[PDB]
Scaffold this active site. Structure first.
Site: not given
Ligand SMILES: [Br-]
Lengths: 395, 395
Positions: A137, A185
């Site tokens: 991420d 996310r």
């Protein structure tokens, strides 16, 4: 004593976290005099709690070297993030004369190292805890980038490029829109990599849906339409964590595809990479691989130099692209994430800016291919020989 | 003088169809005296109908050579299947002195190619029609394998392997099942590729759901459960065309995943390759690329030899693996599908047999990586110079 080391992987795995493991293990082996036996936690920190340790010393040098080109977590990982737990960790390290704790994970791992280090001294058994950075991420602060992100970015860029060539050849009378769902996310770094498929010499319509941007079906369809009109087709890269006027919108690719058909009447195709994007060692970034190995090696060197509660970092010295190893205090990493810059996303919110490209591009540079056997990557599987238990069971 | 050639790509594209295009073009260029100019139809047969032709004679040698490592259809493809349409083709071919018709596609293209002959012959227009094999589904008869399949198979095997290494390392306390949806609506050759991820040296649980085998949820969940108990995790490769009782089964991946959580309560993860599996030139099969190029080269050699209504094939002569070019009659290829043989699937119908492995393994052998630039494959985009129109429009 306290000369033995403990290495564990945490959170979601990546295509190069084993390269970091190799960096740690090979650096530790070259020590000896400083570092004794090298243990690994089976399935991560949980392995430490349940005293399921692996003796990495029983792996051949060839097997460890092979970790540099093997995806995922060779010792297993977990998402287990407690006074009783922390005290138990110290008890286990003490029973096995462990004085070093190398935790390879994301943001949460940083805090764990900080707590392990501080509680160990309080309990009369100090332990040097070093955080080895990892996260697809790319949300760790201070470091220029995070081990694992560069490879996911390369995979997404290459995949977006290939899917675009495909839809383009079919767009005349068939499919005109391709939608690819990617991870991320909360952060949009992964999705941003999709914009790398397009270049100044070869422009390709890549509409990106970032988690940071509020989804506007109206603006979206307008953008796609304009792209189809200009190029004859359009590729859409969408993060799993995209939210509309409300929150969240089970795939996100099937949903976006339907909106395109419903509002523009264009034939579509969609895909969800899921795990493939984070285990793609067959097309990993050479730069990312070298940086991942570097961070593991540096963790050991810092420990031996006497540092504690720190995290090695990647320092971008220049953009040709040049980097060196830096060091951050965990008090600076604990919490506080590396959010995607606002000036990295275009005005319309569907693409990456030249500033973003300058940052991302160097990260995916170079190819590091694993060796092949019978048509497939000859990935390694460690023996992972268990260590005899010394304490009573833990629940 | 009726010495010009017409080449067109048809149907879904693959990662190596341009390798076939290169074989045709480079072979045709060494001719001359037999072949005058090599025109390609922009967007396939549609290009012949709307008189939108491309003069490949104006493409640089370097660009044509680059087609060998570029995915999809560089000339554009299409899915187009009355006397007016044939009369138009004849007008167009006559206007451009085209006496050779090279149609690069799969099963449906084979029929089109057959009609362009059987009908043009009774119509009194000297035109030789040669079918160039292509299909990621591997469903063409007579030939041992189809250009495009070997590369999709390598991609599926590699992806399944990487996804398996990933799920395995998280299986202890997290995700235990990974479901991957692949192509192949009637043939299970694609799905079969998933079984190559496993081998005797390193067994990996891979439950394959073939289109040929009727789906039985009870037998499925049982097979999965038994895998999770023996290995701790399970990988499932499911074709988009799998059907149960009422034939059916937003795609098949999410559906199958649900069945696992429902009947077994096991945490899951799923992906859908879609376009990625047929445009993955970054991880194509070297063997496949060579066969793709050989088929294009052979088509031209056949045309110059005076053949008509035929398709070059790949003939397995040995297994080490050795092959040669063969010649099949289109009438025996037209509207015939090569499904998975019953003995290529295991008794419980969830895996591939050793006979299958013997057949498949050689097809994915070798790696043929394209050159890179700025982190991405340097795929070519042809200039594709247009040929000035000579006739009235057509709708
Ligand atoms: Br003939």
């Amino acid at each position: 004593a306290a000369k033995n080391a403990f290495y564990a992987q945490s959170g979601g795995v990546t295509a190069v976290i084993n390269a970091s493991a190799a960096g740690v293990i090979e650096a530790a082996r070259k020590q000896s005099g400083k570092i004794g036996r090298i243990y690994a936690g089976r399935n991560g920190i949980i392995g430490a709690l349940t005293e399921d340790l692996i003796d990495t010393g029983q792996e051949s040098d060839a097997a460890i070297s092979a970790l540099r080109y093997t995806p995922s977590g060779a010792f297993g990982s977990c998402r287990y993030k407690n006074r009783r737990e922390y005290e138990r960790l110290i008890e286990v390290f003490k029973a096995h004369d462990i004085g070093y704790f190398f935790y390879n994970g994301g943001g949460d791992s940083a805090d764990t190292c900080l707590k392990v280090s501080q509680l160990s001294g309080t309990l009369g058994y100090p332990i040097q805890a070093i955080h080895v950075p990892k996260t697809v991420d790319n949300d760790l602060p201070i470091t220029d980038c995070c081990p694992g992100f560069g490879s996911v970015a390369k995979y997404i860029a290459v995949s977006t490029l290939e899917a675009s060539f495909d839809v383009a050849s079919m767009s005349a009378t068939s499919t005109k829109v391709f939608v690819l769902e990617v991870m991320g996310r909360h952060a949009g770094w992964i999705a941003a990599a999709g914009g790398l498929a397009s270049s100044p010499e070869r422009e390709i319509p890549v509409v990106i849906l970032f988690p940071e941007i509020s989804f506007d079906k109206q603006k979206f369809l307008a953008k796609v339409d304009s792209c189809v009109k200009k190029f004859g087709y359009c590729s859409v890269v969408v993060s799993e964590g995209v939210k509309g006027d409300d929150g969240k919108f089970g795939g996100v690719a099937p949903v976006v595809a339907s909106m395109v058909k419903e509002g523009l009447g264009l034939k579509y195709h969609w895909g969800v990479a899921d795990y493939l994007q984070r285990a793609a060692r067959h097309i990993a970034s050479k730069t990312d691989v070298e940086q991942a190995y570097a961070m593991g090696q540096a963790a050991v060197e810092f420990a031996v130099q006497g540092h504690n509660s720190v995290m090695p970092t990647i320092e971008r010295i220049s953009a040709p692209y040049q980097w060196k190893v830096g060091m951050a205090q965990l008090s600076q990493v604990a919490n506080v994430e590396k959010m995607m810059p606002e000036n990295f996303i275009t005005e319309d919110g569907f693409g990456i800016t030249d500033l973003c490209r300058e940052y991302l591009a160097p990260l995916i540079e170079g190819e590091d291919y694993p060796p092949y056997k019978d048509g497939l990557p000859d990935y390694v599987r460690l023996k992972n020989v268990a260590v005899p238990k010394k304490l009573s069971g833990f629940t």
